[model samples]
Target: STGSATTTPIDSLDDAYITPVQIGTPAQTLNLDFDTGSSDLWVFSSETTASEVDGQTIYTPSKSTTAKLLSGATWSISYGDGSSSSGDVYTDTVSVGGLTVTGQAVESAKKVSSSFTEDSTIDGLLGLAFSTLNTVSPTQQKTFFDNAKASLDSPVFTADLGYHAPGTYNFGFIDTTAYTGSITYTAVSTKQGFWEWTSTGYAVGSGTFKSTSIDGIADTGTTLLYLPATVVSAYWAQVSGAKSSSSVGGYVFPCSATLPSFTFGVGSARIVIPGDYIDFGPISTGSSSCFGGIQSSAGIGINIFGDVALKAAFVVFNGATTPTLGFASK
Candidate 1:
């Protein structure tokens, strides 16, 4: 059987995308971030400390007759942004967009760092990366996609993240009607447990496409596009008032500045990101300065094609042989 689900934008802008997931025998619903950057299906639960669970919904496994604790098992994970969540493990029935996986390892958070607690809307995370990156100790866990792939008509899912609007995450099959033009497929290396690939080169605004190869990952959970510090500097040099700001954290420019499009080479295809998307948004409410959606991935060591970039195309996270990435115009 096949299944699909609609992903709604939680904020006025494209900060993050969330989809509804049903857990337990009776099916308690929770909103989760479908992240390809990390592996581990974890959720906030009754196990979490009361103070840390503020303003967020909790998943009570005890209420689900199908929930079974994995005795002595534990999980912990940290993000590049310094966010972390850790807890005990339980096996239960988890369903997403009508796709159900029984005995799925569900990591219930007992302690959540301020980064997660601060984002009250995201109840948990649905890791879509390779299973090798799972955090469960002693025995790693499989993602809902990995567990349900065998039963799916095709082992692929499409991420169509929209800009300041709604989108969809389709599973078990591809929707030809969702995108335009032939998808340009690029080989991906999953040895790192990420959808990592290399771009032939990139360009700023209308500048010539540089032949420099940049290695990066297509991460849906990440909010902005990140590149090497030098590349970020070059891009900002084109904007008269753009500069790296310690206070703003990354490069910031006047909101009225005319931004340039960023183009990346994917195999034989060229993906161009419009200039408007480059200006993330206002630095803060009532501020004339805007933070750049494209910034330096200096300390991270790897470039990230986050929502700002992903929104420009329809992406195919093909888990088939060799695990490829297919991109096409939206």
Candidate 2:
């Protein structure tokens, strides 16, 4: 009826979050990125090209007793990072923290792009977006969340992203102790198959809350917080030595530069992101240039409330017919 999974940042910069999941009859485990920005529960598998495996783990459906081929089913997805993968589909017994979902659709990768091939930390991705965004065709498949929704104690999942620590994703229940302050609920827009919402406004450290509605997807998959160019510009300008660097292709500042905390609204509540959290990390080892965690979304087409933002609050994704998102400070 309920489930709990521990998700951890792949690196110190919090580039991505990975959770361990069990697949097939014998419960083979793999670390997968829990991505909400897209919907497709895909994995690197036996069918994946040998040249593309690149040290990542692979799921072998053929080795599992309960795995069933989804005849004539296939899927393909191109990610924002320019990485892509396409695969065949199969139904299997999948478990997340012992929450079992029999016949859960698991796409097995046959091909992958350079980015995926090179990133050895994740074996695949567990998409948390609405099922409508699933890439499977001829017979679109439901995500793990959707297939398990009916059996859950409640149709809700909560995200508690950590800052340089282990995080948790709790399903069918809200652990009130994980957060402080009363929750602020806001209506969600799944029209784009994303957990999209509009924030009331934002504030830059010590500054007044600017009353403006900024719409974005709460994408745990993405690495940085992206906002309007105007807002991004405002934040970076406050950092004494910050600049938009052509070399790095984003706002960067000297390691000694003082950064300001950022605050965004969820209904009437405010979630403040500490200044240190906004300094992603040094662009490279021994580099004095630190990349800003908050960047302009102008070129990204859509604003993204990525890991930088999620780490600041406990987020609830209520999958009611008419869904709502709940936010509370930790």
Candidate 3:
């Protein structure tokens, strides 16, 4: 959401590198969002293009003291948001939380005009959603997860999402307390790049839970659940005065409604999403009444079950114990 900021406002690029310093090693401190929707370890660089890297927090290699550029290979990303950034590939001893991994493939943006850097609060993103959306390839090279998966003792990735702190999301071990379903297996398709699946059943209010025969893909990179428009319209129709309001690129719903208990299906496993999550803040449409417990995206390609969906189940993506995801009772 950057409007108009200079490409690399701070010339001493290393000055603006704002990754989580929790990573133990110098090489592991370059924090990035592990996005599955798009696979690429990108960071704002001091040496990026003025027009492209505009408004982004530039992480100067000078500030890193231990980072090295990878022979100046060009790296770029284009998103559904119509924004893109390109830079030279570099190697960093970047780290996250408290873990440290080295020789990590990180990109230093040479051009970033999307205005992502204007925010002083937002650091770089670590894309860990999945391999289907990855910019890096498994055949050519191993992603950060591909390389470090073996090192993780339990070999599991977890996130602690705080309502007040959007960016306060933490990564590490999965919280067993947060999940309750037994894991099941779903085969992947040939055309699918992202490992995605749909919830077979759902229910809201005191209504009978219906297995819409619809499925939703568990997406970590996406923030909201992208449900079928038919389901959304069906849901809103049930609410007395539920209406859409503008909020965080989606509709917002009221917090005090007889919001029905919502559950989604993963294989034979039935998962429930709590109401506290359903009623998040206000919307823009002046409908003091938000979009009830559900929002609409209907035809928006694949239905992404975002953090809200993940919070309902304990998902295990074990590259160590097994190659497939392990779902267990939370």
All candidates: CA RMSD in angstroms? 1.2, 0.9, 7.8
Ranking by TM-score: 2, 1, 3
Model 1 C-alpha lDDT per residue in residues 2-114, reported as the tens digit of each score: 76888887787678898999999899899999999988999999999988987777899999999999998999999988899999999999888888899999999999999
Residue-level error in angstroms, candidate 1, position 195 = 0.6
TM-score of each: 0.97, 0.98, 0.74
Question: Least accurate stretch of 10 residues (summed lDDT) in model 2?
Answer: 8-17
Q: In model 1, what is the error at residue 243, expressed in angstroms?
A: 0.3
lDDT of 2 by residue, 100-215 (tens): 99999999999999999988999999999999999998899998989989999999988999998999998899999999978899999999999999999999999999989999
Give the runs in model 3 whose Cα sits over 4 Å from its true position. 1-31, 48-57, 113-115, 129-133, 136-141, 160-191, 244-258, 285-293, 320-323, 326-330
User: What lDDT would candidate 2 get against the real structure?
Assistant: 0.92
Query: Model 1 clash pairs?
Result: none
Candidate with the greatest TM-score versus the true structure: 2
For lDDT, the strongest prediction is 2
Candidate 2 TM-score to native: 0.98
